[PDB]
Write an enzyme that holds these catalytic residues in place. Structure first.
Site, short mmCIF file in Angstrom:
data_model
loop_
_atom_site.label_atom_id
_atom_site.label_comp_id
_atom_site.label_asym_id
_atom_site.label_seq_id
_atom_site.Cartn_x
_atom_site.Cartn_y
_atom_site.Cartn_z
N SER A 122 0.81 -1.24 0.00
CA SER A 122 0.00 0.00 0.00
C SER A 122 0.81 1.24 0.00
CB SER A 122 -0.97 0.01 1.18
OG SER A 122 -1.99 -0.93 0.79
N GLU B 135 -6.90 4.66 8.95
CA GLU B 135 -7.30 3.48 8.22
C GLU B 135 -8.81 3.41 8.01
OE1 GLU B 135 -7.28 -0.10 6.27
OE2 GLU B 135 -5.72 1.37 6.44
N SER C 200 -20.39 9.41 -5.53
CA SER C 200 -20.56 10.65 -6.32
C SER C 200 -20.71 10.40 -7.80
CB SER C 200 -19.34 11.57 -6.14
OG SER C 200 -19.32 11.99 -4.76
N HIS D 16 -10.48 5.71 20.57
CA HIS D 16 -10.41 4.25 20.69
C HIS D 16 -9.85 3.84 22.06
CE1 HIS D 16 -11.68 3.65 16.49
NE2 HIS D 16 -10.94 4.72 16.26
N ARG E 251 -18.26 -7.26 23.30
CA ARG E 251 -17.63 -7.74 22.04
C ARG E 251 -16.75 -8.94 22.39
NH1 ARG E 251 -14.42 -2.79 18.95
NH2 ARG E 251 -13.81 -4.65 17.66
C1 HEA Z 1 -15.49 2.98 7.26
C2 HEA Z 1 -15.20 2.81 8.54
C3 HEA Z 1 -15.65 3.76 9.59
C4 HEA Z 1 -16.07 5.09 9.45
C5 HEA Z 1 -16.27 5.98 8.22
C6 HEA Z 1 -16.25 5.54 10.76
C7 HEA Z 1 -16.78 6.85 11.09
C8 HEA Z 1 -16.91 7.30 12.47
N1 HEA Z 1 -16.65 6.61 13.64
FE1 HEA Z 1 -16.07 4.71 13.76
N2 HEA Z 1 -15.32 2.86 13.91
C9 HEA Z 1 -15.00 2.02 12.88
C10 HEA Z 1 -15.15 2.26 11.47
C11 HEA Z 1 -15.58 3.49 10.95
N3 HEA Z 1 -16.01 4.54 11.67
C12 HEA Z 1 -14.46 0.84 13.30
C13 HEA Z 1 -13.92 -0.40 12.55
C14 HEA Z 1 -14.48 0.94 14.71
C15 HEA Z 1 -13.95 -0.10 15.71
C16 HEA Z 1 -12.46 -0.22 15.81
C17 HEA Z 1 -12.30 -1.42 16.76
O1 HEA Z 1 -12.40 -1.19 17.98
O2 HEA Z 1 -12.16 -2.57 16.36
C18 HEA Z 1 -14.97 2.22 15.03
C19 HEA Z 1 -15.01 2.65 16.39
C20 HEA Z 1 -15.36 4.01 16.76
C21 HEA Z 1 -15.21 4.53 18.06
C22 HEA Z 1 -14.68 3.82 19.29
C23 HEA Z 1 -15.85 3.46 20.21
C24 HEA Z 1 -15.21 2.46 21.18
O3 HEA Z 1 -14.36 1.57 20.86
O4 HEA Z 1 -15.71 2.58 22.26
C25 HEA Z 1 -15.62 5.81 17.92
C26 HEA Z 1 -15.74 6.82 18.96
O5 HEA Z 1 -15.56 8.01 18.75
C27 HEA Z 1 -16.00 6.04 16.58
C28 HEA Z 1 -16.61 7.23 16.09
C29 HEA Z 1 -16.81 7.44 14.66
C30 HEA Z 1 -17.22 8.70 14.14
C31 HEA Z 1 -17.55 9.87 15.02
C32 HEA Z 1 -17.24 8.61 12.78
C33 HEA Z 1 -17.63 9.72 11.80
O6 HEA Z 1 -16.53 9.87 10.85
C34 HEA Z 1 -19.01 9.63 11.20
C35 HEA Z 1 -19.43 10.91 10.45
C36 HEA Z 1 -20.77 10.71 9.71
C37 HEA Z 1 -21.94 11.29 10.15
C38 HEA Z 1 -22.06 12.17 11.40
C39 HEA Z 1 -23.22 11.10 9.36
C40 HEA Z 1 -23.30 12.05 8.13
C41 HEA Z 1 -23.66 13.46 8.54
C42 HEA Z 1 -24.84 14.13 8.50
C43 HEA Z 1 -26.14 13.69 7.94
C44 HEA Z 1 -24.73 15.55 9.00
C45 HEA Z 1 -25.28 15.91 10.39
C46 HEA Z 1 -24.97 15.23 11.71
C47 HEA Z 1 -24.84 15.68 13.01
C48 HEA Z 1 -25.05 17.14 13.39
C49 HEA Z 1 -24.54 14.72 14.15
N4 HEA Z 1 -15.84 4.92 15.90
CU LIG Z 2 -11.14 6.33 15.14
#
Ligand code: HEA
Ligand SMILES: [Cu+2]
Ligand SMILES: CCCCCCCCCCCCCCCCCC(=O)OCC(COC(=O)CCCCCCCCCCCCCCCCC)OC(=O)CCCCCCCCCCCCCCCCC
Ligand SMILES: CCCCC/C=C/C/C=C/C/C=C\C/C=C\CCCC(=O)O[C@H](COC(=O)CCCCCCCCCCCCCCCCC)COP(=O)(O)OCCN
Ligand SMILES: CCCCCC/C=C\CCCCCCCCCC(=O)O[C@H](COC(=O)CCCCCCCCCCCCCCC)COP(=O)(O)OC[C@@H](O)CO
Ligand SMILES: CCCCCCCCCCO[C@@H]1OC(CO)[C@@H](O[C@H]2OC(CO)[C@@H](O)[C@H](O)[C@@H]2O)[C@@H](O)[C@H]1O
Ligand code: CUA
Ligand SMILES: [Mg+2]
Ligand code: NA
Ligand SMILES: [Zn+2]
Lengths: 49, 79, 84, 46, 58, 227, 259, 144, 514, 43, 98, 105, 73
Positions: free
Chosen positions: I157, I242, I255, I291, I438
């Site tokens: 990568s 990642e 898009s 995390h 989990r």
């Molecule tokens: C493609 C993969 C992906 C994506 C894009 C995201 C996007 C986000 N993730 Fe996620 N997340 C994971 C994959 C992903 N995550 C994975 C794999 C884990 C677990 C890791 C592990 O422990 O194994 C994880 C775990 C994880 C945690 C840890 C929780 C824990 O272990 O206790 C947190 C906490 O903040 C978090 C938050 C978020 C947030 C805030 C976003 C944001 O980027 C989301 C933004 C999108 C939106 C908000 C919706 C669109 C917006 C609107 C319609 C506008 C208006 C909205 C508001 C005013 C609220 N994620």
């Molecule tokens: Cu994160």
């Protein structure tokens, strides 16, 4: 000139739906799957001590 | 003199979730105190507070390990 | 800083060669002098079997498993102290 | 140089739909089977 | 030393159909066959090692 | 404890868990609002024969859609962070208790006065007494006084574990060489269950936590009899 | 016939052999760590050198001998090389983070201080200061080599380049000697861990940078470079400044501030 | 008339609501009668019959708006077949229950469940909303 | 012929084809692993007998889906095929290095499989935290094979990112600025910059794990003064970037799909879309300790990371909104790809909203390491990334192959999958709110009903994946060759016919400066 | 998109067969391992 | 401190790199390294698009700062127009390498 | 921007070009149906007359179908447009898609 | 026979969007009222009613008699 959907659509719809319902209802109710639903309103508590 | 201890009070030196060093400082304090006293002829019981505090906060296996290392001469802290 | 020297009109080969022989290499000769002068052996410090040092959580994959790769008998103790 | 055009720009042959079906079955089928065989291997090792 | 770049340019630009890695002649091929044999033999050996390590040696 | 077909959180047992319930309700109402709004807008974009496929102007509408989410975020963050700091506030505890993770069981140390310690293992399923909860019960419960501020210190002697009790709003990782603090306050007596919450090996699913919360007098008699 | 200026490369076996050589090296290291045996490792190191030798030979054939490095192609190589240096910076950044983490908050098992109880650090004014002057002086001579090349001066270029390489070898010998003399080892807790992994990876990069300069040296002996078209030498100079800068950070962080 | 793949670089015909006048006529090769018809289109259009006006439309365009916009019965086939494969899945679940899954733990026996429920009420599990809040401690029955 | 073409390739299209074949086969392996996870949980009790085997299966499921299925298909597959065709470039900047990025992946995959074959496998979770990952709780070679697997995938990568960034900045028509390239190209460029910065930090961390395990270092071992929490910092410093790397090329494809099947000639708000992707790319480097909200960090640190994490919603909602505005006034063509895209837009929003809930370090105390996290991320991965992948695959398949799918079959496939994933993951919200951890092979009895349902859902998605295989076969079996494609004047990748020839743009495009 | 008619049309019958063989290539091997899981467990 | 011995490009550059250097020196761009300058693009003053076959892809940026480029094949023959802004392009085939 | 009356005038003038060719006729209509409007009868009138100059009966009918299509669910727009155009239709002999039977699927 | 009046002919998509975005909002606002009445407010009141005459010793005493405790028979 009627297409696949014009000739078969209704028959696929009716019998897909009929089949799906029957086999899900059978599976969910007749083969001993423990769903473990809420006791509230359903189980009469018994003394355990 | 001034005891009546329930448990180790809040200590503004260690205000966060990580209390590792709160155990450690009190363990050193006590033994540094106990050196000074037992040597220079005096009463170990002024050292008592430190001892109470570290007994409360420090896991038994840590205190026990550190005791053995003091006996052994491999205790890495400065006493 | 601007240093204490001058030229900045032509930064050509000539200037860089001047600096190589007139500044860079002489500093190297001086640090070499400073070095082959502060050298000569420190009386190696006593062995204390501290538990945070001489770590062996798995044996090394060479020799007898217990000697580090550039092990120097004079200054590196094993976990059981200096060798004979 | 290389052949061009539909069915030509891929490392497998699509000349015969049935040989192709056999090739696809092995290819995807061996991917999907593999973790079941790894679990078996781990149960049988002890 | 002498500048023999033009002779190598002529050699390597010869229109003989060879890809660049074989174009310098017979030594290219030997170097190529050696690499490829050690790569493929090595890989077969490492699969063998894997098969060996997958069962306990009690 | 959780009960069958539960949808949401365990009933709060501590004031902090109660604060989290209300903060969660406020956040989820926003979430429902936004996702339903998005769904509604989609169905709206897709249900007309009218078209307008020439260029549209972006810079004007883009203000609404940046300022709005921004006000909404602030609306979640204020109360979120108020609760955060509350979980951190100077508390003055009456009791300190240590828990050490191990593979796979917890041990507890109450060493404020005496040297009380003990191990707490899951009860195997084949040894459960009728009415006891598969995977949840331990042999030796964590007896504590109700209505008091207790300082828990958490650590581990081997790999990472995590000490959690959902009803009380508690989860703190158990990291060898480190002492993490959290504080526990129960509003009610009773039995409160939790489970190791950091993968620690083969028996991660099987080293649960049971708190027994009783009046102080009973806690003292219990402690003396556990030496 | 093309009418763009970019290079369509002839189909090549070196990707596949470099990928297989990666398999053999990582497998071989596992054999070595766990099944005590170096055979697979030795074979992987071997196919890896063969792949690097043939691959970069072919790039020289394509450019010095066949003329495929147009200015468009050359711009690409510049970007490629800068991007690769950037990834190497972030790589080292993980090791400086580990060092700062451990040293700004020393734990009870160390004695709660830094350097830990029982460790005797090298004196930064001795050989480490000398190493520093060595690498800095070689950043000056390599700039002389670059200017000589630009002005068309073959003899001075070779001379400046030779000096640079010698300073590099000298740093590598000083450092081997220092490793042997050091009273602490890689097994001496987090102090020896961060010391030897950070300086060890840097020492490996000095040997790769010296090797790259030596390849430039021979290519220049053979007249491959023009006063204008010499990207292999420029890439090697940038990579050599990088190794110099990483050394400065190690010297200030680990030898000086952390002693 | 007959579209070829190798004509990808040439303008082609499309029927789209938003591109009503395509880049080429649907029919470009004219029979003798179709040429005489195109001659006739150069004169007054009141002189054309309805059949000739239609034929002119069909040389230029392939489908009319009404044709290109017609709805179909495809949704029935899609929903129908989807339900078929979803019912098919239940068969795999039946097989799984019958041949892979052993008996569940003895804690789901009816009597165990009745005792465990009493014990959970004794210990007042979720007494504010979730569980014991639904039990009447005085009348000893589930709140109706 | 065959070896030169397929093992010695220097052609961006054939290399993209190999990546598609590779990822689809890794997809099968990741899916069977997920079915095994759901089989163990689909009724109370233990099915595997062996809880180390369960943890091995969970760990491998994750590595296979992220490293060998999602990233090869989106970056290596779609990126190789589409990016040169979108900017009129005759190939990638480094076409021979590119082939090494591809060939590094089968050996990397082989090492991961080997780790589950030897000893008792690596039952660590995909984060591979010490000390559980260390040489005492995980003695022997499995975790070391895993670390080497990740090395080879990280090098593949990183060299791929250097290729894509150089190509995209250096090989456009001399008159085209960066602000005239399609959104998918921007999405790949920005993804390559994240990969280039975050993978070497991962590599530094697992190297330090390897030495703790084999060279008597103690980076992570409190006995030598090390700290297991340093590992988590290094890992999540890579692991947050990642997640954004997994979703961003899907944002680029969505898009194009929504624009195309709306009959529009450009996405609404092109500069807002580019701004939003750069902003997400930037913010995705400064949020990673969300995390780590339970490991015991200072309250202020936690307040900062809650706050920084919430900001990410803003540029994200700009994209969501711009997708909808693109639909607005469209001439909507109900193709299978457009159905995948509409499902992406909605489900990705649900999954992003649950991520916002988790962003509160307060509330996260109670949701961390529960099934509510699993719900969140399967919404954005198995219904975001994967729906974008399916949408892109049905849309561009006729370009890649020269043949069309049966659209009716493709719509059935979408319907079945849609039912399956929702039934599998939706009930996981209840399980995590109600406190189910989990990484558990079995659960207290109260959690039975949701787990039962979730496992049934998973068999419905199995039925869909099998059907998809059949659909691809039917298309190559039938050989309906493409005639005509709409909207080529704003979709340059279709302008060379289907499939395009081996060498395209030998004569480049002509674009005036003006 | 528009396309030519199938060069090698796949009839309803041929689809039944390709669907069936596809489904079995996924189901039979997994079914066999799962069916025998119990023999592997105590064994 | 001064002598020669380093070849120049003029002396030593070869293949494509040489072809580019020599053509640049005559102000020619047979390898399309530069952006072509637009004419008025009217019917009487079309953009002339050189090519070595009978068709070449044109991208028209109809208005400054459009983010979307309009793509189409230009064939040998009469001038064709951009489908979006109507400006004119005419293919001029041939020659390039002699 | 420009006012409604200005926009309408511009499009009238466009189709009124005496030597408008077939390319420009297509380009204009295909651009016009991109806007959020059903064009004013006077625009449609000019466009039908341009078809008469180009001797293209078929495009004149297509233009009427597109007008009906643009109105979407507003059933009252198309009968009003046909009313306003009826003299031009009679004069040029233009049949409506309904008169030709082209409205029936 | 009477002429038809001239109907609205421009901005019909914009007009449809104007009308319904208000609707989109309203639903939400009137729903907001709903989550916050049927759930959130109900919750505050459940807790406050429970604790208003709660006696933790009496609760303990009922648990003790049911035989639930290890420390208190
Ligand atoms: C493609 C993969 C992906 C994506 C894009 C995201 C996007 C986000 N993730 Fe996620 N997340 C994971 C994959 C992903 N995550 C994975 C794999 C884990 C677990 C890791 C592990 O422990 O194994 C994880 C775990 C994880 C945690 C840890 C929780 C824990 O272990 O206790 C947190 C906490 O903040 C978090 C938050 C978020 C947030 C805030 C976003 C944001 O980027 C989301 C933004 C999108 C939106 C908000 C919706 C669109 C917006 C609107 C319609 C506008 C208006 C909205 C508001 C005013 C609220 N994620
Ligand atoms: Cu994160
Ligand atoms: C499959 C099993 C489902 C079981 C349902 C519940 C049983 C009722 C018991 C009987 C009821 C008895 C009453 C007791 C109330 C308990 C209160 C409480 O303590 O509880 C707090 C709870 C309670 O919340 C609820 O009150 C239930 C939420 C149900 C959401 C509606 C969507 C349902 C869709 C379909 C489900 C699956 C398929 C596809 C799902 C589609 C994805 C959304 O827990 C949650 O946080 C879960 C929500 C997770 C976050 C989801 C984010 C957005 C989701 C979808 C947006 C749709 C908006 C447009 C509207 C969308 C319309 C389609
Ligand atoms: C003269 C300075 C030049 C340094 C390089 C030359 C020396 C030998 C080889 C090492 C080079 C490779 C990388 C460096 C990594 C490991 C640390 C090596 C630094 C070193 O050489 O440390 C020695 C320990 O060496 C040891 O164990 C060495 C054990 C050798 C094992 C090789 C380690 C295998 C690990 C490979 C990890 C590779 C993953 C890289 C990822 C690539 C990114 C994707 C220090 O000696 P000591 O006796 O402990 O103390 C001195 C006491 N008098
Ligand atoms: C015991 C020692 C071995 C240990 C392992 C690795 C060691 C060996 C590495 C030594 C690096 C040598 C690289 C030599 C590259 C030679 C080819 C070359 O330099 O090619 C040049 C192009 O640059 C290009 O591709 C640039 C290619 C640049 C590659 C630089 C890469 C550095 C490699 C790092 C390798 C691993 C990193 C370590 C991480 C653990 C050719 O262009 P010019 O110079 O303009 O010529 C043309 C003119 O003549 C025309 O007039
Ligand atoms: C997560 C994915 C898994 C999805 C569910 C799998 C669906 C199962 C399809 C069935 O596959 C098989 O069916 C068997 C029978 O039911 C087995 O025969 C066994 O059973 C017999 C009789 O019951 C004997 O005929 C045989 O020897 C035989 O081994 C077995 O071999 C297996 O191939
Ligand atoms: Cu202990 Cu999980
Ligand atoms: Mg955790
Ligand atoms: Na289970
Ligand atoms: Zn234009």
């Amino acid at each position: 000139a009627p297409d696949f959907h014009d000739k078969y659509g209704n028959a696929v719809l009716a019998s897909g739906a009929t089949f799906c319902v029957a086999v899900w209802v059978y599976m969910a109710t007749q083969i001993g799957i423990e769903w473990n639903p809420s006791p509230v309103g359903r189980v009469t508590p018994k003394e355990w001590r | 003199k001034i005891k009546n201890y329930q448990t180790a009070p809040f200590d503004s030196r260690f205000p966060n979730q990580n209390q590792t060093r709160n155990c450690w400082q009190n363990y050193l304090d006590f033994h540094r105190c106990e050196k000074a006293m037992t040597a220079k002829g005096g009463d170990v019981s002024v050292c008592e507070w430190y001892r109470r505090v570290y007994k409360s906060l420090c896991p038994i296996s840590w205190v026990s390990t550190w005791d053995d290392r003091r006996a052994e001469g491999t205790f890495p802290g400065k006493i | 800083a601007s240093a204490a020297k001058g030229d900045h009109g032509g930064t050509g080969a000539r200037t860089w060669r001047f600096l190589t022989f007139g500044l860079a290499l002489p500093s190297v000769a001086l640090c070499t002098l400073n070095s082959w002068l502060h050298s000569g052996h420190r009386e190696r410090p006593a062995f204390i079997p501290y538990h945070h040092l001489r770590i062996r959580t798995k044996p090394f994959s060479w020799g007898d498993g217990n000697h580090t790769f550039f092990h120097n008998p004079r200054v590196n103790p094993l976990p059981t102290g200096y060798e004979k | 140089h290389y052949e061009e055009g539909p069915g030509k720009n891929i490392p497998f042959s699509v000349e015969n739909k049935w040989r192709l079906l056999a090739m696809m079955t092995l290819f995807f089928g061996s991917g999907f089977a593999a973790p079941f065989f790894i679990v078996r291997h781990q149960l049988l090792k002890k | 030393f002498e500048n023999r770049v033009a002779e190598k340019q002529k050699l390597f630009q010869e229109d003989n159909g060879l890809p660049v890695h074989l174009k310098g002649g017979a030594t290219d091929n030997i170097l190529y066959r050696v690499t490829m044999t050690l790569c493929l033999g090595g890989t077969l050996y490492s699969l063998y090692c894997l098969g060996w390590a997958s069962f306990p040696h009690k | 404890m959780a009960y069958p077909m539960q949808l949401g959180f365990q009933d709060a047992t501590s004031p902090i868990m109660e604060e989290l319930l209300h903060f969660h309700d406020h956040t989820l109402m926003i979430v429902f609002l936004i996702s339903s709004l998005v769904l509604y807008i989609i169905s709206l974009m897709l249900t007309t024969k009218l078209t307008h496929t020439s260029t549209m102007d972006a810079q004007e509408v883009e203000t609404i859609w940046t300022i709005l989410p921004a006000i909404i975020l602030i609306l979640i963050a204020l109360p979120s962070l108020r609760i955060l700091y509350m979980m951190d506030e100077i508390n003055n505890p009456s009791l300190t208790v240590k828990t050490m993770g191990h593979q796979w069981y917890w041990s507890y140390e109450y060493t404020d006065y005496e040297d009380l310690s003990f191990d707490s293992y899951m009860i195997p399923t084949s040894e459960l007494k009728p009415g006891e909860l598969r995977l949840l019960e331990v042999d030796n419960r964590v007896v504590l006084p109700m209505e008091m501020t207790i300082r828990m210190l958490v650590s581990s002697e081997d790999v990472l574990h995590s000490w959690a009790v959902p009803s009380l709003g508690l989860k703190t990782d158990a990291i060898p060489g480190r002492l993490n603090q959290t504080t526990l306050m129960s509003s009610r007596p009773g039995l409160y269950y939790g489970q190791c919450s950091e993968i620690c090996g083969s028996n991660h699913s099987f080293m649960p936590i049971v708190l027994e919360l009783v009046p102080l007098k009973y806690f003292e008699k219990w402690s003396a009899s556990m030496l | 016939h093309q009418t763009h200026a970019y290079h369509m490369v002839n189909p090549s076996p070196w990707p596949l052999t470099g990928a297989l050589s990666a398999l053999l090296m990582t497998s071989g290291l596992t054999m070595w760590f766990h099944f005590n045996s170096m055979t697979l490792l030795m074979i992987g190191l071997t196919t890896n050198m063969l792949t690097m030798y043939q691959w970069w030979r072919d790039v020289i054939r394509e450019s010095t001998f066949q003329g495929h490095h147009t200015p468009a192609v050359q711009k690409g190589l510049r970007y490629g090389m800068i991007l690769f240096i950037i990834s190497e910076v972030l790589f080292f950044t993980g090791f400086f983070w580990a060092f700062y983490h451990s040293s700004l908050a020393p734990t009870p098992e160390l004695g709660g201080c830094w350097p830990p109880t029982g460790i005797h650090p090298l004196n930064p004014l001795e050989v480490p200061l000398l190493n520093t002057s060595v690498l800095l002086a070689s950043g000056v001579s390599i700039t002389w080599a670059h200017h000589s090349l630009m002005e068309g001066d073959r003899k001075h270029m070779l001379q400046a380049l030779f000096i640079t390489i010698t300073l590099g070898v000298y740093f590598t010998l000083l450092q081997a000697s220092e490793y042997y003399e050091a009273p602490f080892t890689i097994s001496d807790g987090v102090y020896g861990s961060t010391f030897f992994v950070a300086t060890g990876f840097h020492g490996l990069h000095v040997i790769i940078g010296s090797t790259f300069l030596i390849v430039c040296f021979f290519r220049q002996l053979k007249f491959h470079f023009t006063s204008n078209h010499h990207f292999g030498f420029e890439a090697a100079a940038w990579y050599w400044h990088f190794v110099d800068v990483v050394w400065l950070f190690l010297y200030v962080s680990i030898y000086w501030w952390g002693s | 008339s007959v579209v070829k793949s190798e004509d990808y670089a040439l303008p082609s015909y499309v029927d789209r609501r938003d591109y009503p006048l395509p880049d080429v006529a649907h029919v470009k090769n004219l029979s003798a009668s179709q040429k005489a018809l195109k001659e006739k289109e150069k004169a007054s259009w009141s002189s054309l019959s309805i059949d000739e006006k239609v034929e002119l439309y069909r040389l230029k365009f392939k489908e009319s708006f009404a044709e290109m916009n017609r709805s179909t019965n495809e949704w029935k086939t899609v929903v129908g077949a989807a339900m078929f494969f979803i019912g098919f899945t239940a068969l795999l679940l039946i097989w799984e229950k019958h041949y892979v899954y052993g008996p569940i733990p003895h804690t789901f026996e009816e009597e165990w469940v009745a005792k465990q429920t009493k014990r959970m009420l004794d210990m007042k599990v979720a007494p504010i909303q979730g569980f014991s809040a639904k039990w009447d401690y005085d009348k000893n029955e589930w709140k109706k | 012929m065959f070896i030169n073409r397929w093992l010695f390739s220097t052609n961006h299209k054939d290399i993209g084809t190999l990546y598609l074949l590779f990822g689809a086969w890794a997809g099968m392996v990741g899916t069977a692993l997920s079915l095994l996870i759901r089989a163990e949980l689909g009724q109370p009790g233990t099915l595997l007998g062996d809880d180390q085997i369960y943890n091995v299966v969970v760990t491998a499921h994750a590595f296979v889906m992220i490293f060998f299925m999602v990233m090869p298909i989106m970056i290596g597959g779609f990126g190789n095929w589409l990016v040169p065709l979108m900017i009129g470039a005759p190939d990638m900047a480094f076409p021979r290095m590119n082939n090494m990025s591809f060939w590094l992946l089968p050996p990397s995959f082989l090492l991961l499989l080997a780790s589950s074959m030897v000893e008792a496998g690596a039952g660590t979770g995909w984060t591979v935290y010490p000390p559980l990952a260390g040489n005492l709780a995980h003695a022997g070679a499995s975790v070391d094979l895993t670390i080497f697997s990740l090395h080879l995938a990280g090098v593949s990568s990183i060299l791929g990112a250097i290729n894509f960034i150089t190509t995209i900045i250096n090989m456009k028509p001399p008159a085209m600025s960066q602000y005239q390239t399609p959104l998918f190209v921007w999405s790949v460029m920005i993804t390559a910059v994240l990969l280039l910065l975050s993978l070497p930090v991962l590599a530094a961390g697992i190297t330090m794990l390897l030495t703790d395990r084999n060279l008597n270092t103690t980076f992570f071992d409190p006995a030598g003064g090390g700290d297991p929490i340093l590992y988590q910092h290094l890992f999540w410093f890579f692991g947050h970037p990642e997640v954004y790397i997994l979703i961003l090329p899907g944002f680029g494809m969505i898009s194009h799909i929504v624009t195309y099947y709306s009959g529009k000639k450009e996405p609404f708000g092109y500069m807002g879309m580019v701004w939003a992707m750069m902003s997400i790319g930037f913010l995705g480097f400064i949020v990673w300790a969300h995390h780590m909200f339970t490991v015991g960090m200072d309250v202020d640190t936690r307040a900062y990371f809650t706050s920084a994490t919430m900001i990410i919603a803003i540029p994200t909602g700009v994209k969501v909104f711009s997708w909808l505005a693109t639909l607005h006034g469209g001439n909507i063509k109900w193709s299978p790809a457009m159905m995948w895209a509409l499902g992406f837009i909605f489900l990705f929003t649900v999954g992003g909203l649950t991520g916002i809930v988790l962003a509160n370090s307060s509330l996260d105390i109670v949701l961390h390491d529960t099934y509510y996290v699993v719900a969140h991320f399967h919404y954005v991965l198995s219904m975001g990334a994967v729906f974008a992948i399916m949408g892109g695959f049905v849309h561009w398949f006729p370009l890649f192959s020269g043949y069309t799918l049966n659209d009716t079959w493709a719509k059935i496939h979408f319907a079945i999958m849609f039912v399956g994933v929702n039934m599998t993951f939706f009930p996981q919200h209840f399980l995590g709110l109600s406190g189910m951890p989990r990484r558990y092979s079995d659960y207290p009895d109260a959690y039975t009903m949701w787990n039962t349902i979730s496992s049934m859902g998973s068999f419905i998605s199995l039925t869909a994946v099998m059907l998809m295989v059949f659909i691809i076969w039917e298309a190559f079996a039938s050989k309906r060759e493409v005639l005509t494609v709409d909207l080529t004047t704003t979709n340059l990748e279709w302008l060379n016919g289907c499939p395009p020839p081996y060498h395209t743009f030998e004569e480049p495009t002509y674009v005036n400066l003006k | 998109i528009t396309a030519k008619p199938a060069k090698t049309p796949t009839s309803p019958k041929e689809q039944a067969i390709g669907l069936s063989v596809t489904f079995l290539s996924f189901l039979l091997p997994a079914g066999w391992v799962l069916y025998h899981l119990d023999n592997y467990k105590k064994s | 401190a001064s002598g020669g011995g380093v070849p120049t490009d003029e002396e030593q550059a070869t293949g494509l790199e040489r072809e580019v250097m020599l053509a640049a020196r005559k102000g020619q761009d047979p390898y399309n390294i530069l952006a072509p300058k637009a004419t008025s693009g009217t019917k009487e003053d079309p953009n002339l698009v050189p090519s070595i076959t009978n068709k070449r892809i044109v991208g028209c940026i109809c208005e400054e700062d459009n983010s979307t480029v309009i793509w189409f094949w230009l064939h040998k023959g009469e001038a064709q127009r951009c489908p979006s802004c109507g400006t004119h392009y005419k293919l001029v085939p041939h020659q390039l390498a002699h | 921007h420009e006012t409604d009356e200005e926009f309408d005038a511009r499009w009238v003038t466009y189709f009124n070009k005496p030597d408008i060719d077939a390319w420009e006729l297509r380009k204009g209509m295909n651009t016009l149906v991109g806007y959020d409007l059903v064009p004013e009868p006077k625009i449609i009138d000019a466009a039908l007359r341009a078809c008469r100059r180009l001797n293209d009966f078929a495009s004149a009918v297509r233009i009427l179908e597109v007008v009906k299509d643009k109105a979407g669910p507003h059933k009252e727009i198309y009968p009003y447009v046909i009313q306003e155009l009826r003299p031009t239709l009679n004069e040029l002999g233009i049949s409506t898609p309904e008169e030709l039977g082209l409205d029936k699927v | 026979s009477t002429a038809l009046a001239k109907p609205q002919m421009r901005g019909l998509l914009a007009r449809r969007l104007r009308f319904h975005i208000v609707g989109a909002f309203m639903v939400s606002l009137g729903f907001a009222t709903f989550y916050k009445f049927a759930v959130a407010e109900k919750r505050k009141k459940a807790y406050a009613d429970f604790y208003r005459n709660y006696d933790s010793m009496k609760d303990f005493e009922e648990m003790r008699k049911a035989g639930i405790f290890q420390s208190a028979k």
